[PDB]
Amino acid sequence: QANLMRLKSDLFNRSPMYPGPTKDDPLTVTLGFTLQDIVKVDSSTNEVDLVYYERQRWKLNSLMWDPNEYGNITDFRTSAADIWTPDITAYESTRPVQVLSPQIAVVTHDGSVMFIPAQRLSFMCDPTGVDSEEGVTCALTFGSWVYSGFEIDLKTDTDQVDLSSYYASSKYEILSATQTRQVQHYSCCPEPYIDVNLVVKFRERR
Amino acid sequence: QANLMRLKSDLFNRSPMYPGPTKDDPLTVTLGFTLQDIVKVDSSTNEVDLVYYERQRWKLNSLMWDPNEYGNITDFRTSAADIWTPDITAYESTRPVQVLSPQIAVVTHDGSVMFIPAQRLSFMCDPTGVDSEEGVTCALTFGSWVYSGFEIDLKTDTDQVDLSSYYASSKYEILSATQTRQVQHYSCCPEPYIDVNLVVKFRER
Amino acid sequence: QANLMRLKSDLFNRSPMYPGPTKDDPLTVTLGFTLQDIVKVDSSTNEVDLVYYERQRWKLNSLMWDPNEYGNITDFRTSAADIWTPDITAYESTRPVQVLSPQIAVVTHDGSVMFIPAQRLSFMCDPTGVDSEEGVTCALTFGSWVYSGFEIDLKTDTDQVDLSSYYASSKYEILSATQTRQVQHYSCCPEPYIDVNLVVKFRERR
Amino acid sequence: QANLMRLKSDLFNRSPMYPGPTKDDPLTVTLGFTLQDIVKVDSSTNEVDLVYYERQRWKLNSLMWDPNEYGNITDFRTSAADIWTPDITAYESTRPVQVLSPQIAVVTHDGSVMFIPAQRLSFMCDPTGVDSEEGVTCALTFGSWVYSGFEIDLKTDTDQVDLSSYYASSKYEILSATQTRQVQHYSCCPEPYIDVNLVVKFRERR
Amino acid sequence: QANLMRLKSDLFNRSPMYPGPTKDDPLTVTLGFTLQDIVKVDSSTNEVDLVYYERQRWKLNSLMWDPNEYGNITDFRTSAADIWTPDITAYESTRPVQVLSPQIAVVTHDGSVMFIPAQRLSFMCDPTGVDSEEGVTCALTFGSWVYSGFEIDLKTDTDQVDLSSYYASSKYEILSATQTRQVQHYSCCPEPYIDVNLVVKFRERRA
Ligand SMILES: c1cnc2cc3c(cc2n1)[C@@H]1CNC[C@H]3C1
Ligand SMILES: c1cnc2cc3c(cc2n1)[C@@H]1CNC[C@H]3C1
Ligand SMILES: c1cnc2cc3c(cc2n1)[C@@H]1CNC[C@H]3C1
Ligand SMILES: c1cnc2cc3c(cc2n1)[C@@H]1CNC[C@H]3C1
Ligand SMILES: c1cnc2cc3c(cc2n1)[C@@H]1CNC[C@H]3C1
């Protein structure tokens, strides 16, 4: 309708796009994972394929507006390509990530954004021991590729990976799955980088 | 011709595109499935591959015209990218859905739209017992990814999946195939989301 | 060359693109198949891979010109994106079609266009009996996805499939291959649709 | 720098792109192949995978300039997308060709263009006898997909395929390889088409 | 915010893009490799699959600015598509490289650029002996596709490849990996071309 088209026109045409966070104006992204399925294990290459959602939230003043000035609209859907999004990357991936869902974000009048893409990922993981009762553990680090912790900071809402949607007939059952903020330095660069470490222990279902 | 060229110009360059449904102007999408073939079963990863087509219908006021003002044209075909389409998604997919058909829709003068994409889909399914005679049952949910039931509702015209085009020499025969609207809640959000549950019982032929 | 640049400019830059055929302005589209190779047969999924050319022909008034007014130019080549092309689709495909040739068409001064995309296609076919001498038969139906026979008058030139390019050393030899216009109705719509039925009889070469 | 940006501007922004050759203005394209590696052989489907360079050369008056008018610049590199390039295609491919190199041409002040993409090609080939000492022979025809002998002629600079940088540690070694111009009819068209026939004889290296 | 938006505007939208290096204005690109994983070895086709990232650095006069003129901005992240990048290519690749990371570069006020794409590469390599103690050695050649040494020169900051991030549970363990500038001629062309030669020695992880 008219107001929403007016609102989206204002936010996206009145101004050039948000150029990303800076040291002067850093951003915090809240990251949470929903694990759908461990689809595949490959012991000839030590790769494991994972289907999951990645819940992302951040807030920008450039996406703020007054609902009264727009027929009481307090939020809207929009293509993730219309707006800036964080370069959150899985560091142990072995193939380009595969997108499983539409890429549409919800923007709220207070400038907050929620974006939840579903993905399939192959990543480095030695599955040796997956057929035992103890199972095997693998770890994933999700973080910004190019922004240090002075520009993008990460946090979680919970330490528990959401398993409420996990496929009950998966070849693999999950014994535990956690998500933990952590920080490290890389050789190339002087500043610390922030990541959320996904640690998943699993085994062959029986 | 010039009447159609004028009408399309008067609809797509006339106004900004439809920004999608809202709670004040919700949209009901009608869905129907035609199952072409169960192509492949993988008992090592619990994936099944389906080829099907999905009939989508919906109606937008912004796509309306008086035919009399355009040489009596009552409907036209156009690229799906020229118009807004619903984000209907298979929730259990394990690979990006592969489109097999041109992405073209028909728009009628009353604003109604019909879009029928053919697709190959890999989804989550334990096919254990497909080699028996009782067969195996798998379930598939299709729904808007980002719109709740206050924004997009869904409907089916029939509970029967259309099987009149099913491959007679498929490696798998279909014992039953239903499509049912249902309401679900998800951990991230408090609102109800609507899906259409595709339940397919099948076995080796 | 200046004449051709000027010609393309007048045909494409001036008026908008042809919006496709309609009930008020039906269009004849001619189809012929040149079968190149049956690459692969999979009896675990009943899928067959075929490599072929699809010769497409049609004619538009909006693409006509008088050669006299353009240095006696009688034809040119142009990107398929510059013009309308028919949505011809293989109905029994199981994977997206893989394009093997450049997407370029030839336009002649009388307005006729020829577009010949080479393609690799996987489709449903039960190859039980391919190893015998009576061989196996498979049917494949090509047609517009969205245009009925009120809009597209689909036809072949000949009923014989062009086999003069078929790979002599293929794993599979062709016993017979026909191409025939047929009229079908579909559940969704009341209009009759036109397709070309491709029937191919083939066996393992020996 | 200044003079080069000015030259590229004057070439690409003043007049539009070369629209391709015609009957009355044909273009001769020179072609050489450099074989890098026969990567793979598939005897269940009669497909062979090849990695090669394709050296293309042609000349356009519309790409000529006076170097003295442009700071003694005699040539320059530019994205292949900024200029017209010929639609050379392998007729016997079974999968879309994969590009392995940047796609950048060199344009020289006399209007001559050199373009050398590296590619991987799956094509129709019977490897029956690849493990013998006499090896097996296969052939590949390369030509414009849509320009006939009236619009594009092809020539080779030599009859011999460049094998000087072939990969010494390939599963397959090359006994001989030739490239030869030939003229051919196709069922669709009365105009003959020119191709270059690549004939390669190889065997498994031991 | 506003200054950053204004700065990017002046660099990209006002001046036409850099047309690349020439003999008159040659360019030096510094390259360094960080090897994450040897995923796969195919002895039926002599291909090896490798996951690595590649650190690239160069400097352009045309990317310089005075920070006091732009709210003290000394650097910024920008899409790799917004700027010129070197056409560094693995010569031995057998598949198109698969990009694993966002394609975002960092540009600094002195005109220097840093770009670190992560990639999966399939390349030609005979892995015979990979299941032995002594292992197998393979060589990769990275260089410009179309610029000779008169237009693009290369260097490493060190001769030792970075192995400290190598996945410890790979199927394959690395014995050594070096990265060395080298000069070559090619049949088609009269000018020397520069590359960094990456030599990796590895074997199957056992015991
Ligand atoms: C700027 C541009 N790209 C970078 C890539 C990486 C890093 C910093 C970068 N800074 C370290 C952290 N993230 C991945 C690699 C290495
Ligand atoms: C806004 C944006 N993305 C969403 C993704 C999902 C959901 C709601 C969203 N709302 C729940 C339902 N649909 C899929 C997942 C979870
Ligand atoms: C408009 C848009 N899409 C359609 C898809 C199909 C059909 C008609 C359509 N009309 C029937 C015929 N062609 C393929 C399927 C079903
Ligand atoms: C116009 C457009 N496409 C064509 C494709 C081919 C041919 C002519 C064409 N002319 C014959 C020669 N080139 C490949 C096939 C057949
Ligand atoms: C200009 C344009 N393309 C080239 C391609 C190559 C070469 C030089 C080129 N110069 C030699 C070096 N790079 C790869 C091949 C061969």
TrEMBL record, chain E:
Mg(2+) 6 binds at residue 185. Mg(2+) 5 binds at residues 151, 191. Residues 16-203 form the Neurotransmitter-gated ion-channel ligand-binding domain. Ca(2+) binds at residue 164. Keywords: Calcium, Metal-binding, Receptor, Signal. Disulfide bonds join 125-138, 188-189. Mg(2+) 2 binds at residues 75, 151. GO terms for cellular component: membrane. It holds the Pfam family Neur_chan_LBD. SUPFAM superfamilies: Nicotinic receptor ligand binding domain-like (SSF63712). GO terms for molecular function: extracellular ligand-gated monoatomic ion channel activity; identical protein binding; metal ion binding; transmembrane signaling receptor activity. Mg(2+) 4 binds at residues 148, 151. Mg(2+) 3 binds at residues 75, 191. It comes from the Eukaryota. Glycans are attached at residue 72. CDD domains: LGIC_AChBP (cd18995). This is Soluble acetylcholine receptor. It comes from Aplysia californica. The gene is LOC100533247.
